[PDB]
Subunit: 205 residues, 5 copies
């Protein structure tokens, strides 16, 4: 099957509005932030302006194709795919997507989406000018799907936290840790899941 | 009836331009603001910049499905649903919607849309640096549907008004009260309902 | 008919690109600005930043329905209606529409569209800090339809000037007067009609 | 034909992607800027912020209709028409179109599109505070069509320079001249044409 | 064939979603930045604000037509073509496209798309006020297509750098060099090609 046929099939049958739930599994969404830049920081207002790649991964079996004499992967506009409705709860501006809105789809149905996002957050900026640094916590989860529908997990972070970080930022990254929680809010009786990203950073000497 | 079928049926037959009035009866729309952040304040200009979740709830029986062996709920893009034309009257900027534009639809036809919104308002900022604090009143109602078509239910869950307010804001919340008004404006003959949200807050100190 | 049928018929047959000229006569469009706020003023640059409701009224007989056993009125997305191409001539920013883009349509074909608009203007700000106040003149008319196609007249000097004006603005309204001009510019061969809105205001003391 | 029929026909058959070339002849596009305002000036950065009407005129014979017992002219959304791909070469912001995006089409096929545009430019601001004034040159031409396809031309100019200029601007207009260039650049060995608009202006006493 | 026919065929059959891969070989995309302006510079934050023409060239054989008695070239909206998903890696704002979104298509299938872009970057601004100048490096490559699907090379180095640059900028260009890189990052198993553009510039003085 060629690239054109795969993308035709996906465009014609994909249901961007349908969570690709399988029987009674939640859709396992993995989330991992790779920080590229820290552009503006305010210790007084506890506000931070930040650029990061939001590595998002999940499975959608309906996109799958037989890769016998066919490409293993294609790039697909996200408007033709179901995409998890992730939001950053402590964000104070809408995500400015810097990169083309294309996801990578593998023949088995895996979807890799990695937009570069600039976004401002309300978090702990105290101690940014210290050796210990500030620890800014960014919380990301599904806005409308609870835990029986979307689970979110971090990945494993044994590649350099500064691997893609800008050497020319005023700031440097001491540490990045990722944990998950199941929270129960007063609007709704079900538990919603999130990945908490801890950005320990500081102003350069 | 699986998720895909329900969302197909809703997309195909939902009449998003059509207020889901039942008989002579107004659509009962409940509104409740949960404040997340207070980002900028100006006592001189009486302007406030604020992030809140606008918890909006109503009934549309045309969305309903038999939930016998089916999901109790689905998430649906708001473009495929009728949504109340709520507006904040004392808003001085258009609502910046920070979250995915998806509503939660229950099998009996109840709809929860809970966007996170950043928006600026013109309101009483006097006494923001006092113990008593400022009391900033935000008025929300239907822009074109009068009281025989849309009623607003101003009920508040009695939890911390700071359940999800940012501990890192320069400001803190003393109190949040909600009341309902019914107002005859000179433009038109009929009364329009609103919810008045009183945000009593102050600078930390 | 019911609300759904009326809205279907309007959506299916309304011709948004078509001025609802009746016989050989101009469409009589009435325009009236109700000022809500004055947010920023600069006496040096003669610039003003202002929030107002643009009460716009006109007739479109093609939208009419028999209201015998039917609703007198419905709310309709403006994208499904012809709307006069009004522009504020001395505007220096595009109109930021703050409210839902719905117009109210009466069974006889009468339309009311009354968006809340934030917009900046170039006008006389001199004397803003005086007792006499500044007098800022805003001109509004059709951008492409001349007087044999669109007439604009003001509405009703009844409603108080400060009727909806924010008590929390730094400024107060002394007087609002509205007047129809008819003008033959040198570019074009026909008369264009406008409404001139004179906002006499000042800084509070 | 009535107005509705003419606009239906245009909408149904207009080919917005298709330059209305006749023969091997270029489409004669005339361009003329009428300055309304000069809002911000910086002599240090050589940047200017300006509001002007960009009067654009051209012929599209495919739009023509028999005007025997029919209107001479209609207003048409520019999305239903081919429009020349004009760009200001020395622009440093995208054109902010302030007015409704409607062109005027005459029964013989002439199309008059006069949007009001706010846009910033990089040009010579030196001597703005002098008697002689600054002379800011704005260059406008087709971005992708060369001279055998689009010929850009300056219109007639009995028209007064400050005919429509704001009396309330900090600045005044001494002179506005328009001339035509035909540059063959180093990449591409086909000629590209522009209209150069020279805005001689200064700060008021 | 005439212009209308060519554009119809392209619109009807172009597969904008489909990389025009020929055999298992990569689409050879050439990229070359021509700097028009440098608008704002910050040596403290290492941020730059820049206007450039992003000359992008590539082949799509599916767009080809027989040019025997037909035009050699047409202009085509990019929404009707596949376009490489290029992104500037060190950008900190989304590309503000200043120009009309049209690409030039040649009868053999060559495509030249050359938008003018304003964009901000994070790069080395140190020494901007020196004789040596600052050297700001901008990296551009495909965001989702690796090196077996997209190659990127600079266009050939006979052309010029200052030829299009604004004489009125506060800054001047000393040198522009373009080199190509192929780089495997730890996030992803495949190599991604980029073009690195080195902008050596300085403040006039
Ligand atoms: C509280 N929250 C944001 C996690 C879930 C809100 O529920 C919706 N939107 O249906
Ligand atoms: C006064 N107000 C805004 C509540 C209602 C305006 O009515 C409309 N838009 O038809």
């Amino acid at each position: 099957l060629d690239r054109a046929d795969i993308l035709y099939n996906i465009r014609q049958t994909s249901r961007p509005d349908v969570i690709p739930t399988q029987r009674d599994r939640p859709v396992a969404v993995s989330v991992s932030l790779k920080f590229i830049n820290i552009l503006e920081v305010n210790e007084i207002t506890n506000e931070v302006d930040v650029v990061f790649w939001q590595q998002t991964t999940w499975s959608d079996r309906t996109l799958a194709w037989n890769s016998s004499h066919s490409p293993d992967q294609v790039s697909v506009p996200i408007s033709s795919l179901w995409v998890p409705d992730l939001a950053a709860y402590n964000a104070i501006s809408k995500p400015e997507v810097l990169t083309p809105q294309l996801a990578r789809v593998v023949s088995d149905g895996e979807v890799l989406y990695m937009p570069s996002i600039r976004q401002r957050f309300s978090c702990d900026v105290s101690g940014v000018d210290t050796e210990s640094g500030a620890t800014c916590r960014i919380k990301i989860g599904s806005w409308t799907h609870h835990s029986r529908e979307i689970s979110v997990d971090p990945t494993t972070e044994n590649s350099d936290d500064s691997e893609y970080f800008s050497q020319y930022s005023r700031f440097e990254i001491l540490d990045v840790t990722q944990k998950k929680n199941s929270v129960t809010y007063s609007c709704c009786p079900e538990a919603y899941e999130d990945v908490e990203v801890s950005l320990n950073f500081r102003k350069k000497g």
